[PDB]
Structure formats: structure tokens, C-alpha cells
Paper text:
GLIC is a bacterial homologue of the pentameric ligand-gated ion channels (pLGICs) that mediate the fast chemical neurotransmission of nerve signalling in eukaryotes. Because the activation and allosteric modulation features are conserved among prokaryotic and eukaryotic pLGICs, GLIC is commonly used as a model to study the allosteric transition and structural pharmacology of pLGICs. Unlike the other pLGICs, GLIC displays a particular activation mechanism in which protons, rather than a sizable agonist, trigger ion-channel opening. Here, experimental evidence for carboxylate binding to GLIC is provided by solving its X-ray structures with a series of monocarboxylate and dicarboxylate derivatives, and two carboxylate-binding sites are described: (i) the ‘intersubunit’ site that partially overlaps the canonical pLGIC orthosteric site and (ii) the ‘intrasubunit’ vestibular site, which is only occupied by a subset of the described derivatives.
We thus aimed to check whether dicarboxylic acids are also able to bind GLIC similarly to monocarboxylates. A 2.5 Å resolution structure was obtained from crystals grown in a solution buffered at pH 4.0 using 0.1 M succinate (diC4). In this structure, two identical GLIC pentamers were found in the asymmetric unit, with a c unit-cell parameter that was twice as large as in the other structures described in this study. The succinate molecule bound in the intersubunit site is modelled with one of its carboxylate moieties superimposed on the position of acetate below Loop C. This carboxylate moiety interacts with the side chains of residues from two adjacent subunits: Arg77 (Loop A) and Glu181 (Loop C) from one subunit and Arg105 from the neighbouring subunit. The succinate molecule in the intrasubunit site displayed a higher flexibility than the intersubunit succinate, as seen in the different subunits. Indeed, the first succinate carboxylic moiety binds in the same way (in all subunits) as acetate: through a hydrogen bond to the hydroxyl group of the well conserved Tyr102 and a salt bridge to the guanidinium group of Arg85, which itself makes a salt bridge with Glu104. However, the second carboxylic moiety of the intrasubunit succinate molecule only interacts with the main-chain carbonyl group of Pro74, leading to different binding poses of succinate in the intrasubunit site in the different subunits. Unlike the intersubunit succinate, where both carboxylic groups are tightly coordinated through hydrogen bonds to Arg85, Tyr102 and Glu104, the second carboxylic group of succinate in the intrasubunit site points almost freely towards the solvent and is only loosely coordinated through a hydrogen bond to the main chain of Pro74 in most of the modelled succinate poses.
Residue numbers in the entry:
A (entry chain D), B (entry chain E), C (entry chain A), D (entry chain B), E (entry chain C): 5 to 315
Amino acid sequence: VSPPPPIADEPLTVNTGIYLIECYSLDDKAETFKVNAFLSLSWKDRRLAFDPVRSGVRVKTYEPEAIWIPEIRFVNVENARDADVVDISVSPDGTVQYLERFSARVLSPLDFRRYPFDSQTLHIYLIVRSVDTRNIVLAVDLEKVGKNDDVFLTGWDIESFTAVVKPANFALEDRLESKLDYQLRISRQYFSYIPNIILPMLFILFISWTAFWSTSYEANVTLVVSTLIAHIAFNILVETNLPKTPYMTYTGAIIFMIYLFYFVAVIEVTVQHYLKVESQPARAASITRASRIAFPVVFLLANIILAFLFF
Amino acid sequence: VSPPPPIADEPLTVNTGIYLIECYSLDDKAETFKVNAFLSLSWKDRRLAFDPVRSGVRVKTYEPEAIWIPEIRFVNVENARDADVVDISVSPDGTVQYLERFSARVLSPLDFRRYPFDSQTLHIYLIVRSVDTRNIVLAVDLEKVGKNDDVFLTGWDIESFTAVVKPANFALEDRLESKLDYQLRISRQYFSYIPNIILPMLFILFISWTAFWSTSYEANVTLVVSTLIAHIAFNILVETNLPKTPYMTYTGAIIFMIYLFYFVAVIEVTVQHYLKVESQPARAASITRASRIAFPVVFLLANIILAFLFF
Amino acid sequence: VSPPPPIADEPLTVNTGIYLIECYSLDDKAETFKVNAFLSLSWKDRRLAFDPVRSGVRVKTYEPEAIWIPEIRFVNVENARDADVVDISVSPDGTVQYLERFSARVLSPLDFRRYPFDSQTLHIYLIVRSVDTRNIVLAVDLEKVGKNDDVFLTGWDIESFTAVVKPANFALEDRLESKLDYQLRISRQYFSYIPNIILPMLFILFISWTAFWSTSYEANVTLVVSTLIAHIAFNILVETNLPKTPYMTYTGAIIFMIYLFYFVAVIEVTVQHYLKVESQPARAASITRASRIAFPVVFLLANIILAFLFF
Amino acid sequence: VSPPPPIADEPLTVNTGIYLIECYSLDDKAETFKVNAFLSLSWKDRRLAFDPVRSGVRVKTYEPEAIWIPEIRFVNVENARDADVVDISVSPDGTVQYLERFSARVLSPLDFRRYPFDSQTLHIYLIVRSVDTRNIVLAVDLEKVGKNDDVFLTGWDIESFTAVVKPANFALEDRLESKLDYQLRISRQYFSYIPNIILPMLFILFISWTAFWSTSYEANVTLVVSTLIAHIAFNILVETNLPKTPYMTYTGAIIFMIYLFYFVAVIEVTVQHYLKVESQPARAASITRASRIAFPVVFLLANIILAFLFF
Amino acid sequence: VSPPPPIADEPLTVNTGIYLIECYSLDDKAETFKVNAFLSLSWKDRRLAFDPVRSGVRVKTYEPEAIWIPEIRFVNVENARDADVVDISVSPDGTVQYLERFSARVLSPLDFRRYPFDSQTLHIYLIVRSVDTRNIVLAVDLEKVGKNDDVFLTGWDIESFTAVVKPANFALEDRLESKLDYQLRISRQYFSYIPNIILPMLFILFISWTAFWSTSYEANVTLVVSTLIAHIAFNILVETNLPKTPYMTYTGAIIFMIYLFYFVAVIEVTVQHYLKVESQPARAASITRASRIAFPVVFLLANIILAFLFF
Ligand SMILES: [Cl-]
Ligand SMILES: [Cl-]
Ligand SMILES: [Cl-]
Ligand SMILES: [Cl-]
Ligand SMILES: [Cl-]
Ligand SMILES: [Cl-]
Ligand SMILES: [Cl-]
Ligand code: NA
Ligand code: NA
Ligand code: NA
Ligand code: NA
Ligand code: NA
Ligand code: NA
């Protein structure tokens, strides 16, 4: 059990395929997902060639230990995949058809810039390391790349599962490495974010703006401070669902901007009271009346600017 | 150790059975459940046939390694099941009776639309992949399908555990696949949701409506804003128990609608105060008196409409 | 390696014993506990009988693989126990003395009705399945049933660890099954619940009742609404430490009833205000004075009724 | 592979040693800690005697399976330790020097009475069970007992790692058991508790006492009720870090006592208002002035009494 | 299979290399990180030397079991690494080139003093224990030390991955131990802390300072007490992300100091009210006007002092 020797000096081509059975546990904080799939491998081993007329069989079945099998690994995994060999079939010319079913936890970075209206390209990198005897190169058998219809990733829509057919061949620790990129294109189901986070957050913000139709400082203080505390609750809830990013997320920007609106509303409420106490409610009245238009208008404009920058 | 050869060209029938011992960890967020069960398998292998007279024994016991056993797998599992072979019995005609006890974590999607008054059909898909020598087809031995009396799934009532006797035979990667659907019908024990979430949520909403029997704006602001914060606490509690769905759930709809009622109550309280300050308490009084009837009436009607759409 | 043949048609008796070493992780929500114990097994195998005079030894030690050992399993486990064989001793008559040390996660339902003043009977079900050659029956060797003094289950008092000596013999999938019930009787250490949940919950309720010695509606609204929010915090804390039950628990009933007391106190506060505004403080005064006695009296009586129904 | 026979009737002495490499995950709630250490064992097996002149080697190296090794276990573990044999060296006289590196999760009860100014003695119990052929006794090789300088247990100071050299030899299930006690003495780093829990809790309590310099009932109600809610938040935070104890802890006692101070402050605020309303502010003034001294004095005295009882 | 004998009395040099493939799960509380890397080993075994002319091959491939391999371990790991041997190549002189891919959870203490503007040096300690036959010493092959470009540690910037080429050779349990230090230099991405924790915390503090432009005690009490509760929420959130340290962290110091600012603001608000009630609003006015400058000035100065001490 050693690699098949070359006829000339050509590398050994291992044709690959991944057929997704299950996709689950897409952890946004960890930037990981779990996969249960079929991994098909195919290569020619002339040492295994036979005459079907003399042997009586058109195909030969082998045990993994009985023959040479290329050491194929996943790059972006936590631990080595848990694999169970399904079948090893050898045709008369010595063409081997290997099939295994595996489970793995894949590390794939996510771009949260447009969260929760984001799309991701999850990667599964297949790799083989060349041996001293000969160089091993990877290929894609497009006929053996797919996913079943039942593949459901909770909170996501699956668009496509394709493979970049040209491998990335590079040298690592004085040996050739042949890498294939299997890309799973997904898009977030943003629906739930609207009644659970977005609209509740807007309702409390609009409730704080009723202080612009009130001269009662004590009630105005209760209105703006209480809704601010409710906004803090939603901010904390959102940041518990997401990892910490070295950039601003769309939701993060809106959440942050709303703090400025609460801050300016506290300033308005304070100014209005100060003037009323200073026996100038006429000045206070004009500021409060302006705020009634200014706050929703500036909020609508700032959100248009934010949506423009992010989308 | 190779599959039993056919007498004519007929496929090999592997009769199956699942007897549930334990059902636990039904995770709503993950849409998974854990199962501990017996898996029985039966097929004829004429190569194992014997005369019971000359052998002296009526039934022969074999070790898994000693004989050919079909590679049976579960489709909707996280990882391959943890199995322990209990018994392998062979009758004189060569009929094999295999029994194993296994544990597995099953992926089964849940429909939360009617939550917490929802019913679910959990699936366990048994599968076999055919070999080059012969095609393997699955069957259900109804006598070997069941569950013990002690099977308890916390927070759920188990209705039935049946099997769709006709297998789904299809081609996958140029080989026949034979799939069986084992269905576990369950209904959610909604009891606890009434004193823990539903009634507390209604009590705080009804407490906010006492503002319609008060002219004190500052007290009215405290009443409606405080109860709103308590409503947000319950909303967050509910959404931590459930996954994010691309549809509205029954509880989700009620929770969302109640925000509109708090919003309109803030509008009422603001309007009532504005008019009182504007020296028109007669206009304010008629709006407040109307609200006393309008708010409970509209709440009762909206809930009838919601219950109608969902059930 | 096959089961010992019968002398007459009698079943094979496997004497059992469980000696608890560690008891930990009693999860109320999951209704599971972890156990680390010794499992002793004893049965006669005449094929292993020897003359101690000819052999020179009065006991023979065997490796598990060298001899037939009954396939003993636990019924109510998540996964098969992790076992390490300690010793296998054979006496001249062929009596085998097997000892293993194991760890397992046991599924045992709990009755939360009297929580946190509840007692439980945890079960460990030992089982053996019969073979075609002969029927295997389980027995209890009371001398080999116990627990060490150091066995501590955090938040619980261990009363007894006994075994129901008569096995439950039944037919399952056309083979006899022999089941033994090992019962671990425990009682909850309710101490901590008094200073952590019960008294804090009563203090906030009594703080809300100070509104009956106040004519200040705005202060009364703050008192009752704030303490209600603190009561909601305790309700949520309690329901996070418990699973969802299709029945009321003692704590659950008290917690639920206290919502009614807060609701009626809001009604009182609203009524008192309304009258004091309709220029009838004399009517308001008599209602408030009555409430001072009515609220603690009805609370004390309702709690006596609740404690009576639950204990 | 059986135990070495005795020269006379003496028991077999297995010299032991534990050298700590890593100490981590001291879980207070679970009362467990994780350990990564070296376990050294030494015993004489005269059957392994060799002539170094004939063998050519002065010390023979063996594989665990090749020779008899005593079945040494830990008593207070969740599951059996994960061990990797480092070396097995045999000298000509048949003296075996065994070394393994292991990882285990140890169950060791903690005394929370003085929390967070508590010290603990973590135990690691080594045990061996005797065989029918001969009795096995444990011993401590003090030269092979220690810990590396890098051993850090987060939130704790490690004082000493010693062994009680005299084993506890007792009969269990009709065989001798030899137990050794390895004691890891640790003291909690209380530092963090002062700026994170203790001082924030005292600041909010002192903020509630500003109500004794205020005649404004509505403001006084806000002061005491709000700080009480903040106290409940800290109580919940503390009880999430600790297990439920059938005794009072130091922190638990202080936290509980502070509820009584908030309760009495609510009584004071209510009394002060009632008298002011009853046109007797002179009586109210003397009670409020007394409270200014009484509350801090009684708080300081009660804490001295508590610290005395606990330390 | 025993270690290669020395030519003279020199120790056996095992050249090492670590090439990082994945870096994930840097847990601040646990002070652990997960690593997936290549571990290369190289040493001379003259017993494996061959003539390439006679053998026909320039390199020989071996199975791990077929040859002697040094027992290399990681010091600061939870459990032994999960390793898969990739290749074992032997050159004519007997120079062995070993390569494995492993995954491990590394224990590496973190200095939180400057959090969240902190930098760390994560350590991976490689170790070998010497045998009776000969001493084994570790070395660094700098050509086989690195990391791939795709190596991403969420919330951190990776600066360098180097090795301290001189090993720490010391005696442990009467045998030589050879230790190598692989250092992974990382710096925290502080960006997210600014819009998520720092600015929200400053906004609420600045909102409390609006009480210095208000004579309304009841509104002032609401302002300062409400923002204090919001500050407590952020303190709790921060201490849930960090472990308990026996020193002050930068964030911990700022958070603690802000409590003093809220405390003094409550004192100011109380003093201002007391004087107004005592018919001296002129004294109150001068204190309030001074506070408007004093609070931001002292806050800015105290923060300059804190930043100076910490950086
Ligand atoms: Cl892999
Ligand atoms: Cl499976
Ligand atoms: Cl088991
Ligand atoms: Cl029966
Ligand atoms: Cl039977
Ligand atoms: Cl162990
Ligand atoms: Cl290791
Ligand atoms: Na191979
Ligand atoms: Na087989
Ligand atoms: Na056996
Ligand atoms: Na051995
Ligand atoms: Na208030
Ligand atoms: Na080896």
C-alpha cells in the first residue's frame, strides 16, 4: 500500500465530489457551521486493473485497508471529519470509485456589514498533500457535486452549492498541496428581525418623541429615560447574537445613532424646562414645536444616508 | 463477507423496525431531539441456511464480523448513531434476525406557526444504499415498530409512532437508495404558558388601561411606560425559547400586536394631557371615556381575528 | 462463548448489585442525574468448573473476552454506560463473580408539584434480554447493594438506595426481558429558597401594600408598578430553574396568585384616586382602610388554602 | 498477565506520585475542577527479572499490554481519567517504574460559609482494589509528588499540594481497598468582589438613605424602590455564581440583611408622609432625624456581628 | 522499537516546527484558545539508514508503528492533542521527517490590565521527556515555523508566530525534560467596545448631569437613579465577558469610578433640594452652577490620571 506509480511523469488526479445531506448549527458568534455530506473520490490505480472475462466480475469491491487511498483533508475544520466509508468500487482499467459519508464543523468567516439583510459564501476547502514518489492534484467531478432538497439551514435560504473547478496548487513545507474551494451561497431570512427587534425599537423611540407635546418636565424625564433603558435592553440583546466586529454593522449603526437621538431629546427636554423656569415659555414653545418636525425628519434622512452607505 | 446473491434478479428486502426506549432533549431552537431505541433488521441469506436436525440447533448465533450485514444509515442525523449489537439470530432457511440498540441526535424541522398550541410530526429516515452485485430495498415489519410506556418527552404528549410502509426508492450518485419514514406524532403541553407568560402579559396590559380612569399625566406616563418595559421583558423571554422563523407564530403575533396597543395608549395619554393644558378637558374626557370601551373591545376583536387566522 | 446450557429447563439467574461511588449533576430541567458506581454480576457457568486440588488454585481470574458474560444494559440512560471491568473471579463450582465500575447519565422523571419542598425517587433500571438457547432472569444480591458515605448530591439529602428484589419479567420483540428497579430516595434541601426567593418576594409584596397608607396616586403607581416588575424578575428566575410542567407547582401557584394581589392593588389605587377627584375622599378613605386589613388577611388565608391543597 | 506472587505472605506495595501540570475550570456551582497531571507508579515484579549482560540493555522498556500493571483508579472523578502512558521502565530486579500523563474532572465539595473570603482543601483520592491472589496496598513516594510553578487556578491562590502518606485500608464488597488522599490547599482571590459587587451594593444602599434628608414622598419612593431593584439585580447575579447551600454564606447573609434595611426604610418613608399629611411634621422630623444616625449605626453594628459569627 | 543509540555520548536532537492552519475560540473567561496546526519533527536514526543505489529508492515511507518516534507532548493543554500522522519520510542517512496535523485546546494566561486595549503573547509549550538509554533535546527548525494567511482569530489581530530557539532543559522526576516556547503575539480589536459599551456608558453619565440645570428634585432623582441602573447593566455585561482578576483592569477602573460620580451627583441633588426647602436657594444655586463645571472637569482629569497609570 503505496501511491500508484506514474506511466510517464504526470501527477495523480483525484476527482472529488461533495453531496450535502445536512446543513445545521450556523453559529454567527463562532462563525462555524456543521455539515453532514457524502465525499466521493476517484483515481486510477493500474496495479488494481483486471480482465473482467477471466475474473467473471465487471467490478471489484475493496476494504479501505486492502488498497491505497489518498489522504484527503479539509482545511477549515475544527477537528478532523468523522467519516464512514460507504463503498470502494474498482473497474477493469483500475479506476477506483470511493464514497464516504462524513460530518464536520467548518470554520468560515462571515461579513456582518449588512446584518440582518446579509448574504454569505460559506467555504469548504478540500486538500491533498503530495508524496515523495509522486505529486497529487485535485479535480472536481461536477456530476458528483450537489445537495438534497431537504437541506435546511435554520434562519437562512440556500442559493447554490458549487465548486471552483481549478485547484489552488502551492508549496507548503517542501511539498505540493492541491486545494479545492466548495462554495455554499446563503442569504439570511431577515423576516423575524422586523417584528422582534426593528419595530419594537422604533415604537419606543416614537414614544420618547411624545415629550415634544408635553410641558411636564417630570413626565418628559420619565418618557425619554425609560425608553432609553428599553433601547439599551435591545442593544444588549443584539450584541449577544453577534460577534465583535472591527467594523460597524448596519443594525449596529442604527442602534448607535438612536442613542444620539435620545441624548438630543434629553437636551431638548432640559432646555424647555430651564426656559419655562426662567419665565420664557415663548422661547421654549418655538424649540419644542421645531423638534416635533426636526426629530422625525432628521431620523428619516439619517436612515436614508445609512441605508445608502451600507447597500 | 459480500451481499447474498439473488435466486432470480429480485432485490434484497431488508425488513426494519424501530422500538423507542427513550425520547429526550427536544430542542426547539436547534430543531433536534435525542432518541435511544432498538433497531431490528431482517433479511434472507441462503449461504447461512442449515438443517436443524444434523446441526442439533434450531437457531444459530453470529458475531457481526462473522457475517454480511446491510449498511443501514439514518438520513437526518447530526453524526452516525452510537450502536451496540444486541443479537444476530439465523434460522434454518437462512433468515437473519439482527437487533441493535442505538442513540442518535435527529434533525427534524418544527412548524412554530401555532406555538404554544402546536403539534409536530418528527421524522426518522432509515436508508440503505444498493451495491453493484444487487439492489437493496427497505421494508417495515409493523410488529417490530413501537415504543415503551415509560417514553416521556418533557413538555410534550406523544400521540403515535408509525412508519410509512412504502419506501422512497430513488437514484443518488448512479446507485439506488431505499428510504423509510418513521413518524413520531407529538403535541405540545400548552398548560404552563397560561400562568407563566399569557396571563402575566395580559395583567400588565390591563394595568396600563387604568390610565383611562386617571387625569394625572405623570402617573399615566409611569403606568404605560413601566408596563411596556415589562412587556418587552416577556417578548425577549419568548424569543429566547424559540428559533427565528420566516413566518409569524401565534404568540409572536399577539406579542407584536400588544406593542400597537401600548403605542396607541401613549398617544391617548399625550392627547388627554395636551387638551387639559389647552383648557379643553371636556374634549379630553370624551376621548378617555371612549378609550375605556374601545381598548378592551378592539383587543378582544383583534384576538378573535388572530385566533381565526392561526387555527 | 455462548450462554451456559441448563441442567433442567430452569432460567439462568444473574445476581446483581449496584454500589454508588458518586452522584452528581441532578439537572431539574433535563430530569437527569449522573452516576458513578460499581456493578457486580454473578451467575453459574458449569463449563468453567474445576477441581481446586488438581489445579492448585481455589479461584480463577478471566479476561472478559475469554468467557461468556450476560449482556446487561440500563433502560433509562441517554447513551450506553462507560464501563471498566475491575475483576472476573471463578470459583471451583463455576460460579462467576464479575465486577465493573461504570459512569452513566440517567433519565428519571421528577414530580415538581411540591417544589421546593419536594422529595423524589430516582430510578436506575437494570435489564437483560433472553436468548434462543435459554431465558435469563435478574436477581438482587442485597449484600452488594449500597453507597459510600461520601456520596453527596448538591442541594439534596440522600435518604436510601434500595432495590425492588422481584424483577419485572415481560416479553419484548418475542424474547423475555428481565428488569430490576434500583431506587434512590432523595429530598430537596429547601433552605436556600427562603432567603433567596421566598422572603425577597414577600418583602416586595409588603412594600406594595404601603400604598394603603398613602393618598399620593403618583407615588402609589410607582410603588405597585415597580414591585410588580421586581415580582416578574423573580417569576422569570424561578421558571429558568424548572422545566415546563402540565400541572401547577407549589411555588408556581404562589407566584401566580401574587399577580392577582398586584392587579387588585392597582384597582384599589385607581379607585382611591378617581374618588378623591370626584370630591368623595370619605368613600376612598373607607376602601383604603378596609384594604389595609383585607389584603394581608386574604393573602394569609389563600396561602393556607394553597399549602393545604399541595401538602 | 496476573499479579506478581508474594515471596512470603506480604501485600504488594504500589508507590504512587502525582505531579500537577495544569489546574483549571474550578466550577463552584458544580463543585468540580479539572486536572492535568503526571501519575507515577512503582512496584516489584520478580517475574520481569533480567540479566543485563544477556539482554544487552540495563533497563527494559515495556508496552502496557505486555505486562501486569495495577488497576489504579480515582475515587472522586466524574468519568475514568484520560491517560497516556509516557514510560514503563523495568530494572534487572524486576522493579517497575510506570509513568502516565492524565486529565480528569474531580468532584470535591466546597465550603461556601465564608464566601468570597473562603479557603478550600481539594481532594484527589487514589485507590486500588485487592485481588484474590494477593492484597494490594498504596504508598506515597514524596519525591514524585509536586506541581510546576506555572500551575495557575484562575481566581484562586494555590497554597500547597501534599499527600496523606498513610493509606485508608478498608473492606468493600468482600475485598480490601487501599485509598490515598492527595490534598490541594487553595485560597480564593477576593479582590474583584470588592469593586464589582460589594462597593456597588453599598453605594446603592447609601443612595437610598438620602431619603432621610428629603420630605418629598414621591422622590423618596423612587429612591428606595429603585435602589431595591438594583439590590435584587446584585442578589440574582451572586446566586447565579454559587450553588444552593443548606447553610448561610457570608455574602448571602449581608445580601439578605440589606433587604430588611430597605424594608424598614420604606416603613420610615411611609410613616414620615402619613404624619406630614396628618398635619404633624414635628413628629415626622424627629423620626427622620433619628433615622439619619440609626440606619448607618445599626448597619455598621449588624455587619460587625455578622463578621464575628462568620470569621 | 527503542530510541536510536548514540555514536558518542551526545543527546538526540529532535528538530521541531509548528505551522498554524486554524486559530479559533479565544475564551477570555477560560483563558484558553483552540489551535489546528501541523507539527513537524525531525531526528537521525542510523538504524534506518540505507544505500539508495541498492534499494532503488531515494526516500522510504514508514508507518508510525514500524519505527521509533519521540513522545512529544504539549505542556499547557487541557487534554492530549488529537493528532493524525500525515507523513513519515526517511532519507538514506537515516534522517526521519515526521509530519502530523493536530488540534488542541491551549491554556494560556491573559493580562487584562489594559482591556479592551490589550495585547497578549499566547504560548504553546512543546516538551520531550528523556529515556534511560539517552537524553532527548528539542530544537527549532525556523523554516518549518509559520501560519497560513487565512488564520483569523475573531476579535483579534495576529502580529507574529515565532519560537524561542533555545530550549528550557531541566530535571523533572530524575529525568531530563526539554521544553520549547512557541509564541503567538496578538492584539485586541478594540473598535466594537467604543459604540457598544464606552459611548453608551458616557451618554447615560452625561444624561445624569442634566440634573445640574434642573431645580425639580423629583425629576433629578429619576435622572440620576435611572442612569445609575443603566450603568449597573453595563457593569454586569462587562464582568460577564471577563474573568475575575486579582488586579484592576482599565475598563473595571473607569466603571468603578463612574459609581463615585453618580454617588456625588445624588449628594448634590439632595443638598440642592434641602437648601431650597430651608428657604436658601441662593446657596443651592451656587453649588449647582459649580457642579456644572466641576463634574465634567473632574471626570476629564480623573480619566487622564487613569489612562496615564494604565498606559
Ligand atoms: Cl478532515
Ligand atoms: Cl446512522
Ligand atoms: Cl447501559
Ligand atoms: Cl408479556
Ligand atoms: Cl424468551
Ligand atoms: Cl480514574
Ligand atoms: Cl499533547
Ligand atoms: Na491508504
Ligand atoms: Na458484516
Ligand atoms: Na461474553
Ligand atoms: Na497490563
Ligand atoms: Na417617578
Ligand atoms: Na513508534
